[PDB]
């Protein structure tokens, strides 16, 4: 589920990562690793019983958002527009709301 | 530990297909290769341990490899649907063994 | 995310310079870049968490970034950074380290 | 570190072979090299430590080194003579690691 | 933190040498560079943190670094014994400062 919702984010952001110039090869690779790697953080938290793993998935999402701010506003030329950021932020916040509940459900079963 | 040998079968099928992925998706292709081959290590470490957590970590690795199939299929084209189906069989075969091994250390943890 | 906003200032000053580092120092250039950017995750991890140990690791990160500056201003065949760029960056990093100071304070509570 | 010195024989024999793998197998060639050379660290770390987990870790690394050989065979890129030789050298290392672990497990 | 300054000499001596290793040994070159420069973080992280385990990691790091020299000495022809001899002495100077550092937190504890 969370992975299904998150594939929407990958579907959106992946072509944008692809577009990024080779001039920014290293930032771009780190972005891609952050973006695809996030599935592994969800899967791992799924196949385990530690909240620390969901907390890690969470950091993963916050880091992906940083990447949007980087591509939008630090990288020259910029690789995203205010509205592309916004669209991505929306896709991500959905996943983050699911995650927030998941974490709450688990911390309730203390 | 026929599970490593069933898994070497997944490798034999998937590797030359991954190797043929175009450099246009160079980073996805490398992350995939790394996931594909580094999996063995999850299986090694699991068998030379006593903790179910390392069986789960192995399972996560398999679930991640299936994500890579969905991801690579829906690209543009990196895997023919026949290739996806086929690799799914091989992976499923490894997984049922892993399922039992897992449910076995949980029927033993009682 | 205030400390991160401040740190983005360090990034926007240092990223184009890092990126401009001649390819002959390709390995170092990459490690630099990974340290500079990865550092945001050190703050986020600390942020999405309680433990001071995580705020300490974000402080080591900065300490490692400062090493990269000293190293890059020093190296040769070819050069990589000027002592003036290093000096400018430290001004940006020190502000981030002061905010990190206030934040470690508030937490060690 | 009797084990590192023995392992160095493994590196000596295996590293040139690793090198001459065509760039076609770029990623696998590099992960292999990294396993081969990274193994020394696994040994060093277990030595500058008490935890047995560092030793099993080192054992895992040897298991994985064994997989790379099976892999470079079925790929042409490694003669079965080479596998034969290399497996012996690794067995030699694995021997020493075997003892070392047992001696740490006896209390 | 005279330890980092003492290590920077090791870096000074060794970096140019690492750099002039041919691309023929490209993968080994980089692991060597990663261990070499990477070591600074090991020391830096040790300092911020009381755990002896971090000091052992650093020692393990220095140990790994000495391994690289033997490996590059005989890549068949890529580091002269003299060069190795000279690096040994500079690392040894770091070795002493760590050995003391490690051994004092074993008195303190």
TrEMBL record, chain A:
Pfam family, one: bAvd
Matches recorded under InterPro entries: 23S_rRNA_IVS_sf, bAvd
bAvd-like domain span: 1-106
UniProt signal peptide: none
Protein name per UniProt: Bbp7
Native source species: Bordetella phage BPP-1
